[PDB]
Amino acid sequence: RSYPCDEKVIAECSNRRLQEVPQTVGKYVTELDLSDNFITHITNESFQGLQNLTKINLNHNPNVNGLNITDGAFLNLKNLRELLLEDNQLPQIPSGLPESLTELSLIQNNIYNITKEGISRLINLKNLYLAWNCYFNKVCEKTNIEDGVFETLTNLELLSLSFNSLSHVPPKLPSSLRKLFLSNTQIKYISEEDFKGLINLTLLDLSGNCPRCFNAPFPCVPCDGGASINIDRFAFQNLTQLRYLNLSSTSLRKINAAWFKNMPHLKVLDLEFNYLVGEIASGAFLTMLPRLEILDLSFNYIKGSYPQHINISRNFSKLLSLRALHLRGYVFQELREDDFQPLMQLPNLSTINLGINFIKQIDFKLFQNFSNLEIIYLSENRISPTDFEFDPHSNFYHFTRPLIKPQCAAYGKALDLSLNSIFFIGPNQFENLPDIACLNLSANSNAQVLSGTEFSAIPHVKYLDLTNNRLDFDNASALTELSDLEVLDLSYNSHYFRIAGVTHHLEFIQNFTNLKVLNLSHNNIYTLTDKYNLESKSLVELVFSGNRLDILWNDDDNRYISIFKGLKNLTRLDLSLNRLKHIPNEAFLNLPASLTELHINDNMLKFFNWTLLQQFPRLELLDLRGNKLLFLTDSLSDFTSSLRTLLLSHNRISHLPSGFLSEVSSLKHLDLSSNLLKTINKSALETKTTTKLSMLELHGNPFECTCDIGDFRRWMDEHLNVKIPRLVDVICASPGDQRGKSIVSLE
Amino acid sequence: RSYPCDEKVIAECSNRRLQEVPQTVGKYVTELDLSDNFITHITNESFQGLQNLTKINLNHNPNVNGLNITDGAFLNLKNLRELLLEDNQLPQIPSGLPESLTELSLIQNNIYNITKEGISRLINLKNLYLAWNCYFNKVCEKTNIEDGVFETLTNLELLSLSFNSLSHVPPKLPSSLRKLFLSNTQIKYISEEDFKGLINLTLLDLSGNCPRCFNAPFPCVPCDGGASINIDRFAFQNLTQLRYLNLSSTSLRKINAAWFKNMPHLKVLDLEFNYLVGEIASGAFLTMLPRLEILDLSFNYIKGSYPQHINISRNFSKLLSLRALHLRGYVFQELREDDFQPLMQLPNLSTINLGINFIKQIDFKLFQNFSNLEIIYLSENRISPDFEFDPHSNFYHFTRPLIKPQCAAYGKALDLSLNSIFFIGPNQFENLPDIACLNLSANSNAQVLSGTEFSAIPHVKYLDLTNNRLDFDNASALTELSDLEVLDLSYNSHYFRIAGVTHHLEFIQNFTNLKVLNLSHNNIYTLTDKYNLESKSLVELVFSGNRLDILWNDDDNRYISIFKGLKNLTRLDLSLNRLKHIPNEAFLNLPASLTELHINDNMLKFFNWTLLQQFPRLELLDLRGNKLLFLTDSLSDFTSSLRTLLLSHNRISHLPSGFLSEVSSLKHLDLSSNLLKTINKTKLSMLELHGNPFECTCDIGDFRRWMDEHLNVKIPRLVDVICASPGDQRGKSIVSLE
Ligand SMILES: *[C@@H]1O[C@H](CO)[C@@H](O[C@@H]2O[C@H](CO)[C@@H](O[C@@H]3O[C@H](CO)[C@@H](O)[C@H](O[C@H]4O[C@H](CO)[C@@H](O)[C@H](O)[C@@H]4O)[C@@H]3O)[C@H](O)[C@H]2NC(C)=O)[C@H](O)[C@H]1NC(C)=O
Ligand SMILES: Nc1nc2c(ncn2[C@@H]2O[C@H](COP(=O)(O)O[C@H]3[C@@H](O)[C@H](n4ccc(=O)[nH]c4=O)O[C@@H]3COP(=O)(O)O)[C@H]3OP(=O)(O)O[C@H]32)c(=O)[nH]1
Ligand SMILES: Nc1nc2c(ncn2[C@@H]2O[C@H](COP(=O)(O)O[C@H]3[C@@H](O)[C@H](n4ccc(=O)[nH]c4=O)O[C@@H]3COP(=O)(O)O)[C@H]3OP(=O)(O)O[C@H]32)c(=O)[nH]1
Ligand SMILES: *[C@@H]1O[C@H](CO)[C@@H](O[C@@H]2O[C@H](CO)[C@@H](O[C@@H]3O[C@H](CO)[C@@H](O)[C@H](O)[C@@H]3O)[C@H](O)[C@H]2NC(C)=O)[C@H](O)[C@H]1NC(C)=O
Ligand SMILES: *[C@@H]1O[C@H](CO)[C@@H](O[C@@H]2O[C@H](CO)[C@@H](O[C@@H]3O[C@H](CO)[C@@H](O)[C@H](O)[C@@H]3O)[C@H](O)[C@H]2NC(C)=O)[C@H](O)[C@H]1NC(C)=O
Ligand SMILES: *[C@@H]1O[C@H](CO)[C@@H](O[C@@H]2O[C@H](CO)[C@@H](O[C@@H]3O[C@H](CO)[C@@H](O)[C@H](O)[C@@H]3O)[C@H](O)[C@H]2NC(C)=O)[C@H](O)[C@H]1NC(C)=O
Ligand SMILES: *[C@@H]1O[C@H](CO)[C@@H](O[C@@H]2O[C@H](CO)[C@@H](O)[C@H](O)[C@H]2NC(C)=O)[C@H](O)[C@H]1NC(C)=O
Ligand SMILES: *[C@@H]1O[C@H](CO)[C@@H](O[C@@H]2O[C@H](CO)[C@@H](O)[C@H](O)[C@H]2NC(C)=O)[C@H](O)[C@H]1NC(C)=O
Ligand SMILES: O=c1ccn([C@@H]2O[C@H](CO)[C@@H](O)[C@H]2O)c(=O)[nH]1
Ligand SMILES: O=c1ccn([C@@H]2O[C@H](CO)[C@@H](O)[C@H]2O)c(=O)[nH]1
Ligand SMILES: *[C@@H]1O[C@H](CO)[C@@H](O)[C@H](O)[C@H]1NC(C)=O
Ligand SMILES: *[C@@H]1O[C@H](CO)[C@@H](O)[C@H](O)[C@H]1NC(C)=O
Ligand SMILES: *[C@@H]1O[C@H](CO)[C@@H](O)[C@H](O)[C@H]1NC(C)=O
Ligand SMILES: *[C@@H]1O[C@H](CO)[C@@H](O)[C@H](O)[C@H]1NC(C)=O
Ligand SMILES: *[C@@H]1O[C@H](CO)[C@@H](O)[C@H](O)[C@H]1NC(C)=O
Ligand SMILES: *[C@@H]1O[C@H](CO)[C@@H](O)[C@H](O)[C@H]1NC(C)=O
Ligand SMILES: *[C@@H]1O[C@H](CO)[C@@H](O)[C@H](O)[C@H]1NC(C)=O
Ligand SMILES: *[C@@H]1O[C@H](CO)[C@@H](O)[C@H](O)[C@H]1NC(C)=O
Ligand SMILES: *[C@@H]1O[C@H](CO)[C@@H](O)[C@H](O)[C@H]1NC(C)=O
Ligand SMILES: *[C@@H]1O[C@H](CO)[C@@H](O)[C@H](O)[C@H]1NC(C)=O
């Protein structure tokens, strides 16, 4: 049983409050992650017993001044390939690094000198990350790059120098380079010589040089006069393998078509945060890009300007390989059919993104004229009836999550109208739309009574997101025009459910033939009109967290005692966050016998009637985390043969009953973290049967570390197939000499 | 030093996990509150010490087996006036109650038998509370009322029997009654005899008998065929003093005017949850209410019906004393000027409540022609561009003020909250009166305010725009409101979250008289062009729930002076800003005028205490709920103004030397829920220490000594100042020892 790391050859040793490199790491280990510890010193002794190490991660030590690394500390590790030293306040590149390194990352340090002595003997480097050493209003020096320092790195494939003050492209780069990142480097001019020999390059990032600074979310310094980056006509002429070009925030007003003349493979062009309204309308460069797949022209708005219409050049029609066009933040009032003519015959154009344009009106019928749209993204418009802020490993100019949740988009064509002002759906709201399978109307403040006709023009919606609205459930036929509906999200429509005196009709649920997943979370449901029961022959999953079952199941009221019973196909039920202090026995028995997964976490349960598990023969997962439970039954196997996972974290359990660990044969994963256990007695340990337990969680219990723990420790020694994670957090509260130590580190 | 109660003569002893009546109560106590403890038995031994007890509260024992009370347990208490025994699962009225009692509460027990033996001996009773013993689907017995059980209570002024099954008004009630509460008692018939003797009654509650059960939020049983309650023509004949009549939810469709004939002082008439749409339209009874001040006709809607217009009888014009009219939940589409004609000459009608009517359109100009409207309440419409019920509250409606008092104090108030005014068009507020208090909360207003939207009502002083989604793209926003004093912009996160759109807060500087600004829960992390908040007038800024962790990031200097230009500021709230550290320069740039600084519920591990030298008026500093690991030993050096220092929920381990005994303006220090195991060996007036893990060895005697010598330093909740060690002492207050 490894300690302090979890081994599996990989050693997960991160975030463990470690103060030095442990001398206890399995000597077979090949990758070791010690990130986020409190390590302050690395010497030639730190890794002495571990010469099979391929990979070391030391990022973010010491985690709350800097990591002190001796010359040659690593130089004896002969197989070391990957060394991660991010966010360690290093004042220099460490001296005497091993020649074997293929990957070195020094992101987010204080290194202002890149020197031959540091780097040049690292002949095997493929990827070198030096970004984010001097930037914004950090107090730091201009980066000195020693002439020719990278010239000997003849296998170098990726070099990243972004977010440092460089002023010029470094000369003498190796022609092995595939990816060169030079974002936010204060380079104002790109000469013909700068990228001259780089015939293998596939990615060039020159974003944030001569930035567009209006409304910047960071301290931003424009080029004089807010001028554009100055890229020589021939700067790209030998970049024949280029696939990705990032020119975001280079204050461009003109794009020279001749930049692309030798660039037949360009697939992704990023031109966000420039001043390209004119070029978008004229667009001579568009001719050069018939193989482009992604064009991002987001946030090129003219500030203060809110024109009626977007002006797209007819030459967009040349972008014959286009798959996604991103046009956030152009900012305009109205989208008319004619305005997108140029895009309508593009054969592979799957995605159109018009997020964040403050658009007031759209002629929806225009989307039908497109060849092949799968994603119509119109969120955030005005349609109506550690202790650094930026992730160095992520795109700086846009978020890279999918525009549509994958689970919704998997059904078919997607229309996302979230975060607009469609406060009711009128009779003709969805006229002349493609055949939408995936519809997002989240956060429109929709207060309407859905009545069974609102979705008639798009009747094959299968995944409907209506979260964060204020729907008035006064009509039992609501949404029944959607016969194929499979997923329905009604989360955060509490507005009218909170009001006792208006009607709340949920009867429509029963009308769906194919409804599989229903989310009613965070609605504050405490009262329903006429019918008190939810019923469906199809429903598999009901999320009912964040409601008031404490009131629906009050002891003085019988009406809701069968509320979920009529959900006869149900396998997953979430009753978390319902302020439950007790469940009446009859209510529990009325939960569907079909269940396999039951969550009642984050309530206030003082007691749980285990005997009632007899009625749930298919029940695999029972989640009671975050309650106030005091005891377990001492004959749990009498009550279930199906239970595979039992989660009891964050309760007030102080005693295990005899045999409990091995009571139940089906039980693989028992979570007793953060309870009130002082020991586990031999009594809890006696079985006649082989335990099938695979994971037992125990961190955060106030263990009593005296001789009375020895039985449990031997049990541990005798059942290594039972994984106990976070041994470093399985801690003695007592006695004094033991307090804070892992129960494992005692004699 | 009292224990276990706090005494002040009143002993507050509630909610302290007490398992018996404590024997160490001040012998001089007149009022003892023992509510919410874990007490299971009372005996005539329980209170022996205490004979000048005038009042006992034993509500909610034992808390979370009834309270077992022996006969005559209370009998040797000669001054006991008032006994509270709510929510104790009592199976009977207890035997042997002292005859001194003027007030008895047995609300929320299991008592189904009201007998001479419990009650008839209690001759001084003014107030008797028997409500909520059998109701809803509780398992309980019909309520047996022993014939003439109240006949002897000839001082009795208030009798409450609500929420029990009674079936009949009990006969032989004393004519000393003022208030008779019989709500939800399953009484279907009110006979000419039922209120015989009761010529001094001023209140009668007959609500919930023959209830209107459609959409009930409780188990509701209608009378046969949902018939109305049956009230005899002459049943109110001799109820000449009535001021308050509650007939809510009695399924009335027809009101007999003659019921009010001899009741010309009726002030408050509650008719909610009936079927009175026809009566409201025609209503002869409205002609018999010359002195009525409050009429509540709420939730009389006909289900499924959504008429165009509300139909208000001309006879409303005879309600000459009306001050408030409640018409929630009539449910109608449109309010036209002429529809309120009959109200327009009532000289004292100050409040009109049309909440929850799903009203789509209103002609605002009609309000102009009323006599004296001060509260126009239109919240929750469709305008566009462990028992659940508190036994001491009204059951049919909330009783909080319609408008926050701090807003209404400014003058005429218009509440449009919880509608769909997602933008304010150019004539939205035309023909309104001179509105001073305006509520537009929760309209999902997404608009760019530009300085003209409130031109028609330019004297607004208190503007509530919370829970909207305002787009701050214009420096002139709201500047037409020259007199504005209070602006609430809480919960307008929507656009502030988005980096790429503009966020302009420059308009704040343009107000001469702005006193209070609440920017809470806006997630503010980036602003456009001007990085600083400026105002010569502003006194209080609430900035909680924003991202000062980002605004003051070490790598960015732009917001280091964000609040400095708030030159008049005395109160600043920076709680819930995810702060791990505040840059020293940022702290020093907070206004030197501050008297009150909150930075609670962040994640601060360090505080630079020396910086308090630049805050010479600072009286209150709140650092609760951070991760502070130690205190300065030099506090006297950095402030002579601090009176209150709140440090609860932090990680402090050691009180430094001479902290307490050192200076001086410091009245209140809160160190509760920290990590102190001891305190080692002065206007200080209060010292909180509950929830520390005190080591209760002999090392602790000095502190106890010190406690004994400084009895002018209150230490609240001594029962919660607990030893965590040693194992013997664990769970004990620190006041038990050698
Ligand atoms: C300018 O545009 C260029 C080209 O589009 C863009 O290049 C991309 O940069 C991002 C960010 O560094 C790269 O994405 C990373 O790449 C590797 C995958 O090989 C991953 O290790 C990273 O994932 C980790 O980090 C993510 C964020 O913390 C985690 O969410 C994830 O779970 C991983 O832990 C990450 O995805 C991307 O590879 C390149 N693109 C290409 C084609 O090389 C560049 O970022 C733009 N410039 C700026 C300043 O925005
Ligand atoms: N470029 C961009 N992308 C955005 C934006 N908002 C959301 N996204 C999403 O980020 C995700 C990442 O896009 P990004 O352009 O940064 O990077 C792409 C593209 O650069 C590139 N790519 C992607 C698709 C393609 O056909 N050809 C191609 O070269 O490969 C990256 C991996 O992303 P993936 O498509 O696998 O999720 C995309 O997923 P999505 O289709 O839902 O939309 C994109 C946005 O404003 N701009
Ligand atoms: N009746 C009624 N009142 C409601 C409703 N919604 C909110 N309220 C508020 O509860 C509060 C209590 O009103 P309620 O009718 O229940 O009882 C009044 C009235 O019964 C009575 N009263 C009050 C004022 C008066 O002039 N004459 C009068 O007889 O004294 C009670 C206490 O009022 P308070 O001491 O808080 O000022 C009111 O304050 P508000 O003017 O803003 O409106 C009332 C509602 O739907 N119905
Ligand atoms: C309302 O409830 C639904 C149903 O629970 C929520 O959608 C579900 O969310 C979970 C994420 O918690 C998804 O499961 C996850 O899927 C990913 C991707 O496959 C997987 O990697 C994770 O391990 C996890 O299993 C689940 O797929 C998804 N279901 C559907 C139909 O989309 C929804 O998010 C809730 N809505 C709100 C606003 O909370
Ligand atoms: C029917 O209508 C009448 C109004 O005439 C309601 O009477 C009011 O009842 C409330 C709530 O019980 C009383 O308030 C309480 O008063 C005490 C004593 O002052 C106070 O300590 C409590 O905190 C609480 O405010 C109120 O006094 C009483 N009004 C009068 C004039 O006596 C009655 O509640 C209604 N019935 C139902 C079932 O709602
Ligand atoms: C936005 O911030 C304002 C200013 O803090 C909040 O209004 C203020 O709320 C406090 C209570 O949180 C009011 O003080 C209280 O007054 C009552 C009545 O006198 C008193 O009983 C309390 O002990 C306390 O003093 C304060 O008067 C009030 N200020 C104003 C101008 O109304 C407001 O609630 C915050 N908005 C939101 C949505 O949270
Ligand atoms: C519908 O749109 C809403 C709003 O854009 C989406 O909610 C966002 O979802 C992402 C992905 O999980 C979260 O990280 C964001 O925080 C959400 N934002 C808000 C404001 O809620 C929602 O995911 C979309 N629905 C579908 C099915 O794609
Ligand atoms: C403006 O209207 C809102 C919504 O009606 C009021 O907010 C309510 O205030 C009460 C009193 O504090 C709270 O208990 C309710 O929970 C609030 N409801 C919601 C939905 O926020 C607000 O008080 C009103 N503003 C003024 C100035 O009176
Ligand atoms: O409702 C609108 C309309 C337009 N803009 C413009 O959009 C850009 C980004 O906020 C700015 O130029 C701003 O003027 C808005 O912000 N909000
Ligand atoms: O938008 C509306 C319009 C009317 N109603 C009606 O209002 C009463 C209370 O909800 C019910 O009869 C219902 O029919 C609504 O609920 N919502
Ligand atoms: C780092 O620790 C070493 C011992 O290995 C010590 O000699 C040296 O002074 C330290 N370096 C710094 C920069 O403090
Ligand atoms: C592009 O679309 C056409 C259909 O017009 C199809 O033939 C081709 O396979 C698609 N190409 C890609 C790469 O999807
Ligand atoms: C729902 O609305 C439809 C369409 O307006 C209407 O015909 C029907 O009567 C309503 N259904 C119910 C149950 O009221
Ligand atoms: C919904 O189901 C119920 C009961 O099965 C049926 O009465 C009703 O007509 C169905 N409604 C619709 C609109 O299909
Ligand atoms: C029960 O659930 C599954 C969904 O996985 C579905 O295939 C089956 O059709 C459902 N039963 C009914 C009656 O719809
Ligand atoms: C109106 O109220 C005033 C003062 O509140 C009072 O003098 C007068 O009697 C009331 N008028 C009527 C018609 O009741
Ligand atoms: C605010 O909007 C008004 C009305 O459109 C306009 O006159 C003005 O230019 C805007 N003000 C600012 C400061 O941009
Ligand atoms: C607001 O204040 C500033 C100067 O303090 C001034 O420039 C601006 O014109 C004022 N705005 C208006 C609308 O008065
Ligand atoms: C400062 O605040 C007080 C209100 O508390 C006010 O009397 C004074 O006018 C304010 N100062 C200025 C210059 O407005
Ligand atoms: C307190 O702040 C000042 C800077 O304003 C500095 O002189 C002193 O070092 C600070 N103390 C700490 C602990 O940073």
Torsion of CA A31, A37, A43, A49, to 10 degrees: -40
Neighbours of B147 (CB within 10 A): 9
Which amino acid residue places its CA nearest to atom 9 of ligand 16?
Answer: B321
Picking from B138, B384, B499, the nearest residue to A423 by CB comes out as B384
Nearest CA in chain A to B382: A447
The DSSP code sequence of A351-382 is EEE--SS---EE-GGGGGGSS---EEE--SS-
Phi-psi category of residue A492: left, alpha or beta, with phi > 0 → left and psi -120 to 50 → alpha: left
> Which residues of chain B does A501 touch, with a Cβ-Cβ cutoff of 8 Å?
215, 299, 328-329, 356
Measured in whole angstroms, the distance separating CA A222 from the mean position of its chain's CA atoms is 32
Q: Which of A423, B151, A722 is nearest to A712 (CA)?
A: A722
B293 neighbors B268 (Cβ within 8 angstroms): yes
What string of DSSP letters covers B175-228? TT-SEEE-TTS---EE-TTTTTT-TT--EEE-TTSS---TT-SS---PSGGGPP
CB A423 within 8 A of CB B420: yes
Termini Cα distance of chain A: 15
The SS3 assignment for A193 reads coil
Residue B535 Cβ inside 6 Å of ligand 18? The answer reads no
Please report which residue ranges of A111-252 form alpha helices under DSSP H: 116-119
Smallest CA–CA distance, residue A328 to chain B, in Å, is 10
H/E/C letters for each residue in B213-242? CCCCCCCCCCCHHHCCCEECCCCCCCCCCC
Ligand 5 atom at minimum distance from B203 CA = 5
In angstroms, the CA B645 to CA B666 distance is 8
| Eight-class DSSP state of A718 | H
Is A581 in CB contact (< 8 Å) with chain B? yes
Q: Which atom of ligand 11 is nearest to the CA of A68?
A: 1
Ligand 17 pocket, B40 CB below 6 A?
A: no
Cα separation, A606 vs B508, in Å, equals 51
| SS3 readout for A114-134 | ECHHHHCCCCCCCEEECCCCC
- 3-state SS, one letter per residue, for A500-547: CCCCCCCHHHHHCCCCCEEECCCCCCCCCCCCCCCCECCCCEEECCCC
Q: Name which of A299, A382, A551 is nearest B500 (Cβ-Cβ).
A: A299
Q: What is the distance in A from the centroid of ligand 19 to the CA of B461?
A: 15
Q: Does B211 touch chain A (CB under 8 A)?
A: no
Minimal-distance CA residue of chain A relative to B527: A215
User: Is B215 within 8 Å of A421 when comparing Cβ atoms?
Assistant: no
Whether the CB-CB separation of B91 and B112 falls below 8 Å is answered with no
Distances in Å between the alpha carbon of B311 and those of A399, A517, B322, B336, B364?
A: 55, 45, 18, 11, 18
Phi, psi of B405, deg, nearest 5: -55, -35
Q: Give the residue from B134, B138, B139, B215 with the most A CB atoms within 10 Å of its CB, the best one to mutate.
A: B215
Q: Is the CB of A70 under 6 A from ligand 11?
A: yes
CATH of the domain at A502: 3.80.10.10
Largest CA distance in chain A: 84
Mutate to test the pocket of ligand 15, among A513, A537, A539, A540 (most ligand atoms within 8 A of CB): A540
Task: Tell me which residue range forms the domain holding B309.
Answer: 1-738
Pocket test for ligand 1, best of A394, A397, A398, A400 (most atoms within 8 A of CB): A394
Other beta carbons within 10 angstroms of residue A717's beta carbon come to 10
Distance A348 CA to ligand 8 centre (A): 51
Q: Yes or no: say if A613 and A640 are a contact pair by the CB < 8 Å rule.
A: yes
Question: Where does residue A252 fall: left (phi above 0), alpha (psi -120 to 50 degrees), or beta otherwise?
Answer: beta
Amino acid residing at B248: S
Q: How many Å apart are CA A657 and CA A676, to the nearest integer?
A: 14
- Tell me whether residues B215 and A329 touch, CB distance under 8 A: no
Cα four-point dihedral sign A417, A422, A425, A429: negative
The structural domain count of chain B equals: 1
The whole-angstrom separation of Cα A231 and Cα B673 is 62
In a mutational test of the A interface, the residue from B299, B501, B603, B629 whose CB has the highest number of chain A CBs within 10 Å is B501
| Residue A470: other Cβ atoms inside 10 A | 20
- A151/chain B closest Cα distance in angstroms: 33
Q: Which amino acid is at B461?
A: K
- As a whole number of angstroms, the distance between CA B591 and CA B587 comes to 9
Chain B residues in contact with A421 (beta carbon < 8 A): 422, 444, 446
3-state per-residue secondary structure call for B362-429? ECCHHHHCCCCCCEEECCCCCCCCCCCCCCCCCCCCCCCCCCCHHHHCCCCEEECCCCCCCCCCCCCC
Bridge partner list, B114: B145
Cβ of residue A471 closer than 8 Å to a chain B Cβ: no
A209/A591 Cα distance (integer angstroms): 62
> Using only C-alpha atoms, what is the Rg of chain A?
31
Do residues A138 and B557 touch, judged by C-beta distance below 8 A?
no
- Which one-letter amino acid corresponds to residue A600? I
Distance in angstroms (rounded) separating the CA atoms of residues A703 and A742: 9
Identify the residue whose C-alpha is closest to ligand 7 atom 4. A418
A-chain residues near B581 (CB < 8 A): 387
Torsional class of B583: left (φ above 0), alpha (ψ -120 to 50), beta (otherwise) = beta
Q: Does A225 touch chain B (CB under 8 A)?
A: no
User: Rounded distance, CA B429 to CA B425, Å?
Assistant: 9
Q: Please name every residue paired with B324 in a beta bridge, in sequence order, or none if there are none.
A: B294, B351
Please give the structure tokens belonging to residue B303: 């289900």
Interface of B with A in 645-704 (CB under 8 A): none
* B182 within 8 A of B203, measured Cβ to Cβ: no
Residue nearest to ligand 10 atom 10, measured at CA: A502
C-beta atoms surrounding B444 within 10 Å: 22
Q: Between A and B, how many residue pairs show a Cβ–Cβ distance under 8 A? A: 101
- CA-angle at A604, arms to A602 and A606, nearest 5°: 130
In whole angstroms, give the CA distance from residue B18 to residue A140: 63
Index of the ligand 16 atom closest to the CA of residue B320: 13
Q: Is B119 in contact with B94 (CB distance < 8 Å)?
A: no
A388 secondary structure, DSSP code: S
Technique that determined the structure: X-ray
Continuous segment of H or E residues that includes residue B281: helix B277-281
**Distance between CA atoms of A204 and A236, rounded to whole angstroms?**
10
